[PDB]
Design a protein around this nucleic acid. Structure first.
Lengths: 113, 200, 85, 94
RNA sequence: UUUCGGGGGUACUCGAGUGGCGAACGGGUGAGUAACACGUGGGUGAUCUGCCCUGCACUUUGGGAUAAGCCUGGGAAACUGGGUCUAAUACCGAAUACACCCUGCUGGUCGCAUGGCCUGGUAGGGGAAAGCUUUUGCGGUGUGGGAUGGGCCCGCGGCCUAUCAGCUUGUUGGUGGGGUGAUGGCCUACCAAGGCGACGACGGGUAGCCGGCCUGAGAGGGUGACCGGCCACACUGGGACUGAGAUACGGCCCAGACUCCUACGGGAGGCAGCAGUGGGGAAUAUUGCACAAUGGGCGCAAGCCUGAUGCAGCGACGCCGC
């Protein structure tokens, strides 16, 4: 069975994953049919990106997600869109963007005078 | 590691003063040791090596780190000389010293290594830290009343602050506008000799 | 020999081999009889021997003893041989 | 409301089998001719254009091709050992 | 329930057993291999594909056993014989299917020649299935189509040696058979006498191949450690079986070498898995922790298994930083 797995990357302490499509018989770090997202749990809101169209296609042909990938698919709403039960609502908690360095620089300059 | 032995030795050997206000170098401007007066043979390699030693003993950077800097500077799309000089000038300890907060580069490095500073709101104790555009370097509150910073903040009449930096607060904040260009660096020696040496 | 599933599989593979051997031997016997009947040169005995053998062939294909392509090849050969005679 | 009981397969465009033009150098086997093909690549190091020769075995049923005829071939599945080409037609006789 | 020896039931649960799935993945090594092994690009009108997804049609009917259990025999052991007895989604007979397979006739159409397609039409014959469970319920059979994983064939590309010039007789081709998932001297009978080679056949030596790595201004030279893909092998040499799939590492059979047990009749074993030991050597580590994360197998699920993996220990061995 073709499956939607998570392959591990990054260094020792920091696991960063790629949401790949691969046969169940291949090893974890083996060749991948497709890369359709990434998942970084080390971040505080744990960045998640999933290519919705490719995910829909691969679920349509019958690829089986693993449990973590199923959880991610439920989070992004792709799983529900594939099934159709509640609708496809984006529960994705995106990371809050950081203020620019220039903003803080000008703020410090203004605070000085 | 770090160079720890006497400082004027290097200045006497290299024929120029690197600290800036050293009376021992003025008293004897010739190389140290028994044969510090013997006439020397002239060779391009000697001059290039002496220039490199001047550069890497002014800033207190060891040879491997200096070679890494040179490779980085050559890789960049500018020209090698000023690129290397700007990479050297962007080190945190050099920024601290050039901001007038340290009389000598050695004590600037000592202060940085002891975690007396705080860059962009996060404690940084790494002299080789490179400083980008729009960085705010602050002294942590615990060390504001210390003797070194006390005497640093009431003798702000020494060497002028370069253009690319600006001490802006009564608490001696440091603001970095842009990485220095060759015109504003105001450093001894000649970068072209170093470029020649490392191309050998 | 070292792992329980291996020993159980030894026994089960043996029993499967016995069954497959029986089915294959029966198919071979039927085909051989049909070939002899064709060699004799009569049509009717060849005809319903071909029918019985073809039924045996595809019904052994259903059991998984032989691949369906093999059964199809054998049936085609037997029918063509009968037609030639 | 019921789906179709037959689902036609999605059509796949046919592939392009390789073709060649050569000269007959042997017709001593039945239904088989030997064709010589020429290839002109460039030397990977010195850059000069090099002309190289190769022999293939083709299949013609009636054997209308004599020795010295310029012929046309198209690849095919292995018809025997070493036989992988099919004669299309005789481009010119000689 | 009891004399405290225990006795019955339950089916929560579960040793052993039958049955299914897995065990062909994952992990190791580089001996062999100068080859369609590998890299790159094609072809398959010459082909298979369990589990998975999705249409359609079914899921009818009957039967004979056997493991386990109990009784008993043989042997030192390994293990093994007999009697009786019992169940199934185990095994077997039949009906139905006309979507499928085979054959005869026949229409149209596309070609790239055999041929392919229109589930073309038509006549004859034929091919299956299994139930369990009250709970988010799981399954069985045929068949259409996807997806995945392959098989086979071919162009081109990457070593050294004529102080290795002839090599080949299933060898080159055809026909009819056989065989295979499939084409094919793959095998076979007969027929013909071809095929390859200085554009280096046939021999000899060496070698896993590649993405890459090091060096260099570049071209080029050297190399294939880690990581990633493919290949080959699993004490040595053969062989098939089961299966959707087999170089079957922790399967089987035989032969051999070696190690071990023996009542001398006979039996057992395979670290190039993870640690570890001896030896060789200039030289290379812990008989560690956990399934917490990721991947995998089984299970409806809870769950179980995983020396894969995630970590830790040792060694300035390397890079980087202080």
């Amino acid at each position: 069975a073709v499956k939607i797995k998570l392959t591990r990357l990054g260094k020792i302490r920091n696991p960063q994953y790629r949401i790949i499509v691969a046969d169940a018989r291949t090893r974890r770090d083996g060749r991948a049919i497709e890369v359709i997202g990434r998942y970084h749990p080390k971040e505080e809101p744990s960045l998640i990106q999933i290519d919705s169209e490719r995910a829909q296609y691969w679920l349509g042909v019958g690829a089986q997600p693993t449990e973590p990938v199923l959880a991610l698919l439920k989070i992004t709403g792709d799983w529900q869109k594939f099934k159709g039960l509640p609708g496809a609502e984006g529960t994705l908690k995106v990371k809050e963007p950081k203020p620019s360095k220039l903003d803080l620089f000008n703020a410090a300059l203004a605070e000085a005078e | 590691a770090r160079y720890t032995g006497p400082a004027t030795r290097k200045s006497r050997r290299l024929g120029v003063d690197l600290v800036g206000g050293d009376q021992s170098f003025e008293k004897r401007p010739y190389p140290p040791g028994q044969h510090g007066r013997a006439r020397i043979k002239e060779s391009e390699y000697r001059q290039q090596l002496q220039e490199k030693q001047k550069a890497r003993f002014s800033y207190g950077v060891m040879e491997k780190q200096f070679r890494r800097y040179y490779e980085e500077a050559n890789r960049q799309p500018g020209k090698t000389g000023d690129n290397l000089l700007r990479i050297l000038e962007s080190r945190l300890d050099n920024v601290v010293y050039r901001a007038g907060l340290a009389r000598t580069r050695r004590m600037a490095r000592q202060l940085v290594s002891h975690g007396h500073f705080l860059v962009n709101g996060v404690k940084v104790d790494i002299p080789s830290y490179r400083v980008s555009q729009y960085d705010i370097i602050d002294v942590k509150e615990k060390s504001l009343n210390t003797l070194p910073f006390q005497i640093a903040r009431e003798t702000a009449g020494e060497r002028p602050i370069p253009s690319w930096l600006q001490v802006v607060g009564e608490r001696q904040r440091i603001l970095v506008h842009q990485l220095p260009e060759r015109a504003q660096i105001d450093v001894p020696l000649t970068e072209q000799l170093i470029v020649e040496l490392y191309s050998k | 020999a070292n792992i329980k599933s291996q020993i159980k599989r030894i026994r089960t593979n043996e029993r499967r081999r016995l069954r497959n051997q029986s089915v294959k031997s029966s198919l071979r016997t039927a085909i051989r009889g049909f070939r002899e009947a064709v060699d004799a040169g009569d049509k009717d005995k060849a005809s319903e021997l071909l029918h019985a053998t073809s039924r045996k062939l595809d019904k052994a294909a259903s059991k998984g003893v032989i691949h369906p392509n093999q059964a199809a090849n054998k049936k085609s050969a037997l029918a063509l041989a009968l037609n030639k005679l | 409301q019921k789906g179709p009981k037959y689902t036609p397969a999605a059509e796949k465009p046919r592939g392009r089998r390789k073709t060649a033009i050569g000269y007959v150098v042997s017709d001593k086997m039945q239904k088989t001719i030997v064709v010589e093909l020429e290839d002109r690549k460039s030397h990977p190091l010195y850059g000069k254009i090099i002309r190289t020769t190769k022999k293939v075995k083709a299949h013609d049923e009636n054997g209308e091709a004599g020795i010295g005829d310029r012929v046309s071939l198209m690849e095919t599945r292995p018809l025997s050992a070493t036989k992988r080409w099919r004669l299309v037609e005789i481009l010119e006789k000689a």
